[PDB]
Design an enzyme around this catalytic site. Structure first.
Site, short mmCIF file in Angstrom:
data_model
loop_
_atom_site.label_atom_id
_atom_site.label_comp_id
_atom_site.label_asym_id
_atom_site.label_seq_id
_atom_site.Cartn_x
_atom_site.Cartn_y
_atom_site.Cartn_z
N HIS B 85 7.25 -4.80 29.09
CA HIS B 85 6.58 -4.11 27.95
C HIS B 85 7.00 -2.67 27.36
CE1 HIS B 85 2.78 -6.80 28.55
NE2 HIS B 85 3.76 -7.34 28.45
N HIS B 247 9.71 -15.28 33.11
CA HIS B 247 8.72 -16.01 33.83
C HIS B 247 9.28 -16.77 34.97
CE1 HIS B 247 5.83 -15.78 30.01
NE2 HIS B 247 5.93 -14.57 30.75
N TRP B 298 4.00 -19.47 37.71
CA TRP B 298 4.98 -20.60 37.12
C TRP B 298 6.04 -21.27 38.07
CZ3 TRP B 298 4.53 -15.39 35.37
CH2 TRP B 298 4.06 -15.27 34.17
C1 HEM Z 1 6.49 -15.19 24.33
C2 HEM Z 1 6.76 -14.19 25.14
C3 HEM Z 1 5.69 -13.53 26.19
C4 HEM Z 1 4.39 -14.04 26.52
C5 HEM Z 1 3.65 -14.71 25.70
C6 HEM Z 1 4.23 -13.43 27.78
C7 HEM Z 1 3.02 -13.45 28.19
C8 HEM Z 1 2.47 -12.96 29.62
C9 HEM Z 1 1.14 -12.98 30.26
C10 HEM Z 1 -0.11 -13.00 29.24
C11 HEM Z 1 1.41 -12.23 31.42
C12 HEM Z 1 0.24 -12.28 32.17
C13 HEM Z 1 0.16 -10.66 32.86
C14 HEM Z 1 -1.01 -10.73 34.03
O1 HEM Z 1 -2.36 -11.16 33.61
O2 HEM Z 1 -0.82 -10.09 34.81
C15 HEM Z 1 2.78 -12.15 31.62
C16 HEM Z 1 3.49 -11.71 32.93
C17 HEM Z 1 4.61 -11.62 33.10
N1 HEM Z 1 5.64 -11.40 32.11
FE1 HEM Z 1 5.40 -12.44 30.40
N2 HEM Z 1 5.34 -12.79 28.31
C18 HEM Z 1 6.26 -13.08 27.22
C19 HEM Z 1 7.60 -12.52 27.48
C20 HEM Z 1 8.22 -11.94 28.49
C21 HEM Z 1 9.50 -11.53 28.82
C22 HEM Z 1 10.50 -11.48 27.70
C23 HEM Z 1 9.62 -11.14 29.88
C24 HEM Z 1 10.68 -10.56 30.73
C25 HEM Z 1 12.17 -10.41 30.11
C26 HEM Z 1 8.39 -11.46 30.70
C27 HEM Z 1 8.24 -11.08 32.04
C28 HEM Z 1 6.84 -11.38 32.78
C29 HEM Z 1 6.47 -11.35 34.32
C30 HEM Z 1 7.84 -10.99 35.11
C31 HEM Z 1 5.46 -11.43 34.36
C32 HEM Z 1 4.72 -11.53 35.77
C33 HEM Z 1 4.17 -10.16 36.40
C34 HEM Z 1 3.41 -10.03 37.54
O3 HEM Z 1 3.80 -11.03 38.57
O4 HEM Z 1 2.52 -9.31 37.42
N3 HEM Z 1 7.37 -11.89 29.84
N4 HEM Z 1 3.30 -12.69 30.54
#
Ligand code: HEM
Ligand code: HEM
Ligand code: NA
Ligand code: NA
Lengths: 717, 717
Positions: B85, B247, B298
């Site tokens: 982010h 993810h 996931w």
């Molecule tokens: C279409 C692109 C993406 C969408 C729609 C998306 C959406 C989301 C959402 C809604 C969450 C939930 C956050 C929460 O409620 O704690 C999340 C978590 C996360 N995102 Fe994505 N994301 C996207 C792309 C990415 C990318 C490009 C990366 C890294 C290169 C990434 C890494 C992560 C990780 C590691 C989490 C887990 C965080 C945790 O364990 O608290 N995401 N994402």
């Protein structure tokens, strides 16, 4: 609503409307200033040819320009009005407004309804600014043009001081809550004007010239005249002097309907090159001018100084009438004086008129008493007008050391808050060292020394540059009895000890070195900070500039000093009753008045807290186990996630900070916690709370302390 | 409405809400910066032990804090989202956003809904920042935490560069017009997304995890992913690799109703000390965490790099369902994979789930091909992910010379718009001198010389630090046919001519000295300014710094350079179509992209005007009688009250300025007249239009010229 591009004013304020706005701590930033860093206006204006400048302004004043032809072929009265309006935004409550910054050339003041037509008047002076360039500020030129106008037309002024420094970005000032020009939401009780405002409606200088709310009652108007002028440092005699002497000159402008005057300058199209109020009535200028929409010509000699204004006021009787724009004014009853008053452009001649506010001078009994004596004895009016105008256009100049040039009179003026000249040799390094050790042996605590020095020095405000440590006034009335300075009588013990050190030093000193009480107040705090830094494992020397002198009570206008009393001082965690906003807003405003940056403000709060500078020495924000030690403890602890913060249950503007066991470990105010809560301030706290940060913290704290001690010291700059 | 105190945000924007806001030319002002003016971050970060820092970050990742307990006892996944982010606000249209300024810690970004719970993420890194102090910026620390997290959990990254300098105030950026969080007013037609935005709703990083506008159509979601990721410089392979790679780790949080989640951090009360979205569901943390409203885990190994994402994505069939907080998400059909996916705090173990936007990787034809491959070839995913991740978190770093520290691989990358190493020795003074002459001795005019230099240098935007004159890319596609650069004409001749002089000097040069086309393009413009200054009777020398080198067309991603085409450049009086705001706003925005102050923009416009810098050599604003002379005539004539301005009858967007005799003597655009109409710009003009200002104007013009010439020259400073 809709979020806008940053270049069109978008920003975080739109998402968080009541957001603390730190941009008040970087007004007029160096990057926006077009001159070099070496540029010293005082040095440039010190070499100006004043006589040459007078002749060029004289030449401007009598060369009518086609885009704004000159009433009676003389621009003088227009320029008197211009300077009067420039200085006439001044208000005593916060020291803001006034002529010192040339702020009339910028928004919003350049587009106030009361400043209509002053856009043309400023534009007429560009030939003069052009020829003198960097040697002459717009600020200096605007009020010098009025002063020159007076003398051009037969009135000898008291003198003139140059030195007002031009700025590049308007000071943003609170002018009232009204979101409508000429709106009035600023009275409560029986006609109580909202502090800090000093005008009766939004965009007026002082009062409504048609009377309160447009009701042309001279008696009622006088109440507004008296109160707004009071709020601008003018008493009954000065106010009467100013109105009569001002309206000895020129004429008002209301030749046709107001609804034919265009947008004010900030709202006008590009082609008008910063001019506004473009009129379609006739030629839109000159014989057809519309400024206020009143159409009065007070005297039969509008470009000459004489006693005509009062001869006319008292030598006719007055009935209410309407100008061509439909505004209230007065004309002489029974067709008396018909055709006795000349026309600005050769026309047929007209009969006597006065404004409703002018009749106030003879209808209000205090004003009647003053102006009738000047009817009988005009020489007394000349003297009072001269003193009043001088004070008017210099009120916000600060210490007299700032007045430059060959027209500065030598006489001392009570309203200037004078300090004595230096009359002996000043202390050198060795005496300063010795005196610091003597203060540290005196018994005064670090806390008493730092808080006394802060109290004396932080009384300076950068708006009108009044107050400060020079003068030794903390021991005089009223400062010695201000609540924030003297909660518990502890201040008199400090003053006594410092006076004894002064006496014994002076009777022992080597050959005509003497030291003032004023200097020892500041010196004492510098010495306490050296000791507290040594208690913290730093050996530093706090800078110190001698040369403060001690004013006497007789040279200290007690009532004038009332407005400098702090109602809030977040640096001492003091919050009295009556402030307009929550405490953290007040802190920012206090920092702004001290001319402090956000980093400077931040280090002073953290240092002052652990030094014990707190009002009544209470523990809010004193996040340290150490006593009189200059550490960065305040910032480290504020960033400790082992502390949980909740509003104290007593609902008393304080907060409780609990550790893991649930025991209350720290307490703090809104002012303390805003540094841990606000995302820009916490960023700064993270700099000064790092493991590597303590030497930088001591260092930057000493620099900001030095800056505050030196605020009023224009005698050495 | 009601006007507010300035400390509460009130100001001149409130009386005139669409006024030109000059604050954009003094962002991050120096008085707000707590570090010295001497502070040198490159020198500080050079001293950092990166191994010790990695280890300290790994301590943080595996030490759970009570006020936000760690999923699976590991904060690594949360930090990867934090990093993603941080970098995920970047957009190609203006290059704004990105991780390079640490802007996530300030408003508005610190409080976007999509950035929820990252307040806690950043808070957890304070123990690290506390330890390294001024040797490590928050900006570096935030992405380096994400990078360390990846390595921590078994993914080898391609590398990392340090060097992002922390700033002290939000960079104020247009994020859209919607005044509602998550609101949508940015689409027209069939999903054409408003320029310059790269997100589908206000406060989202890219797209809506529930599909467009909450419609969980994976096919339709992929449409927005492809478009949003492309506007942040990611193609289909990079985009699939980023999502799969991301993810592979962690989970989402939506354990209860979102109406139980408190205000965002800029709105939350003081006692929360910078944190927000305080929540009364359960414990409000850990087991009970609510971040987005979705509850998806996931993979079965949320703290380990492997191929489980795509094996689950493809090894199950997915049906629609609702998280505990009413959010759209997918789960396995048939009850497949019951209890197989582990709980972050020891709960029973749950079924597979996916976001709607995850399903797009399998539903969209193009993504399905790419990810189907990676299902059998995880070595290819791993490779693409490292390449894409590295590019995401470095996209705004500028030239490679700026990447700092021991983790920078030397491999050239095309997305970095690379330029060759300095192949030979560099032209010295004597050499520099002689080549000015050969260029003056060409048939190149000041107009084409100056204009070609400016065309090259002014391609730099300070947002993501792309562009500029290094690389000599003016002779390459696409720059060489940019409507602004060569309206079908003189360019190629200046190019052809300068290449000839390259040989004439190189094919005969003193020893190992050579010179690049790129370095001449600049030096051309420079010597011209020495000529135009001579014609104006001042003998001066324009600094020039050799070192630029020529890139090939093969080293020039033609599409990447498309976003760098000016639809607008006030400094050349060029105004293409498509611009979101009137000309004068496009002028300020372009000066902000060039890092220029208001005084710098002013001297530059005045100077280039009188050198023929204008697009199509147009006469707009060329307020001089002189041919290729470098005077202040632009300023003097701008302030000439003898001239009267009105819009051209033509409705051209131009104005005529008539002398007394009613003759058109000048013409101009909005951009030219704004300098005589805006109260703050005109103040600057009056500095430079004055009698005594000619030397100073030339000086500041050269100094500002030098600055634009050197914008990309990080290789020498
Ligand atoms: C279409 C692109 C993406 C969408 C729609 C998306 C959406 C989301 C959402 C809604 C969450 C939930 C956050 C929460 O409620 O704690 C999340 C978590 C996360 N995102 Fe994505 N994301 C996207 C792309 C990415 C990318 C490009 C990366 C890294 C290169 C990434 C890494 C992560 C990780 C590691 C989490 C887990 C965080 C945790 O364990 O608290 N995401 N994402
Ligand atoms: C009760 C307070 C005052 C009120 C209400 C007041 C009101 C006005 C108004 C309405 C005008 C006419 C504006 C126009 O249409 O052109 C005016 C003119 C003028 N006032 Fe005042 N005034 C006050 C005090 C003063 C003071 C203190 C001075 C200066 C010492 C002054 C000097 C003038 C002058 C010189 C003009 C003439 C401008 C010209 O010739 O073009 N007035 N006043
Ligand atoms: Na008279
Ligand atoms: Na995994």
């Amino acid at each position: 609503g809709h979020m806008k591009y940053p270049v069109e004013g978008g920003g975080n304020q739109d998402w968080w409307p009541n957001r603390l706005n730190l941009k008040v701590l970087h007004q007029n930033p160096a990057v926006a200033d077009p001159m070099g860093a070496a540029f010293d206006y005082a040095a440039e204006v010190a070499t100006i040819d004043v006589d040459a400048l007078t002749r060029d302004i004289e030449e401007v004043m009598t060369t009518s320009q086609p885009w704004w032809p000159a009433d009676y072929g003389h621009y003088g009265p227009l320029f008197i009005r211009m300077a009067w309006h420039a200085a006439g935004t001044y208000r005593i409550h916060d020291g803001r407004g006034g002529a010192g910054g040339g702020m009339q050339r910028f928004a919003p003041l350049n587009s106030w309804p009361d400043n209509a037509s002053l856009d043309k008047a400023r534009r007429l002076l560009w030939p003069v600014k052009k020829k003198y360039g960097k040697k002459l500020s717009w600020a200096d030129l605007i009020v010098f043009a009025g002063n020159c106008a007076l003398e051009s037309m037969g009135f000898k002024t008291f003198g003139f001081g140059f030195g007002r420094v031009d700025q590049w970005e308007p000071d943003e000032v609170y002018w009232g809550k009204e979101a409508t020009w000429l709106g009035d939401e600023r009275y409560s009780g029986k006609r109580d004007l909202e502090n800090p405002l000093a005008a009766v409606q939004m965009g007026l200088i002082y009062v409504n010239p048609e009377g309160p709310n447009g009701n042309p009652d001279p008696m009622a108007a006088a109440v507004d005249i008296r109160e707004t002028f009071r709020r601008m440092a003018m008493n009954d005699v000065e106010t009467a002097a100013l109105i009569v002497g001002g309206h000895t000159f020129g004429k008002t402008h209301g030749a046709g309907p107001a609804d034919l005057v265009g947008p004010e300058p900030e709202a006008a199209p590009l082609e008008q090159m910063g001019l506004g109020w473009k009129s379609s009535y006739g030629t839109g200028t000159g014989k057809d001018a519309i400024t206020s929409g009143i159409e009065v010509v007070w005297t039969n000699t509008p470009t000459k100084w004489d006693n005509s204004f009062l001869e006319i006021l008292y030598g006719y009787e007055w009935e209410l009438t309407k100008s061509p724009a439909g505004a209230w004014q007065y004309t002489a009853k029974d067709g008396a004086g018909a055709g006795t008053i000349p026309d600005p452009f050769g026309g047929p001649g007209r009969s006597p008129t006065m404004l409703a506010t002018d009749l106030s001078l003879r209808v209000d009994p205090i004003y009647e008493r003053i102006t009738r004596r000047w009817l009988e004895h005009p020489e007394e009016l000349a003297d009072e007008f001269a003193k009043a105008w001088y004070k008017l256009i210099h009120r916000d100049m600060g210490p007299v050391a700032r007045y430059l040039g060959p027209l500065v009179p030598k006489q001392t003026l009570l309203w200037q808050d004078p300090v004595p000249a230096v009359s002996h040799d000043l202390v050198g390094e060795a005496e300063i060292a010795s005196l610091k050790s003597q203060i540290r042996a005196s018994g005064l605590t670090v806390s008493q020394l730092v808080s006394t020095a802060w109290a004396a020095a932080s009384s300076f405000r950068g708006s009108d540059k009044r107050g400060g440590a020079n003068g030794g006034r903390i021991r005089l009335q009223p400062q010695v009895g201000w609540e924030v300075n003297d909660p518990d009588g502890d201040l008199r013990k400090v003053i006594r000890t410092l006076e004894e050190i002064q006496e014994s030093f002076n009777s022992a000193a080597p050959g005509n070195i003497k030291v003032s009480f004023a200097d020892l107040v500041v010196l004492g705090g510098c010495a306490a900070i050296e000791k507290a830094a040594k208690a913290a494992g730093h050996n530093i020397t706090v800078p110190f500039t001698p040369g403060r002198t001690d004013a006497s009570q007789e040279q200290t206008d007690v009532e004038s000093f009332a407005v400098l009393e702090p109602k809030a001082d977040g640096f001492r965690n003091y919050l009295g009753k009556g402030n307009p906003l929550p405490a953290e807003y007040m802190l920012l405003d206090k920092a702004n008045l001290l001319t402090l940056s956000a980093p400077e403000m931040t280090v002073l709060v953290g240092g002052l807290r652990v030094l014990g500078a707190n009002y009544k020495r209470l523990p809010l924000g004193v996040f340290t186990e150490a006593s009189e030690s200059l550490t960065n403890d305040f910032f480290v602890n504020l960033l400790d996630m082992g502390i949980t913060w909740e509003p104290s249950p007593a609902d008393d503007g304080t907060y409780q900070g609990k550790d893991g066991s649930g025991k209350v470990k720290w307490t703090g105010s809104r002012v303390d916690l805003v540094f841990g809560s606000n995302s820009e301030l916490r960023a700064l706290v993270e700099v000064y709370g790092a493991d590597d940060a303590q030497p930088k913290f001591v260092q930057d704290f000493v620099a900001a302390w030095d800056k505050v001690m030196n605020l009023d010291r224009f005698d050495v700059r």
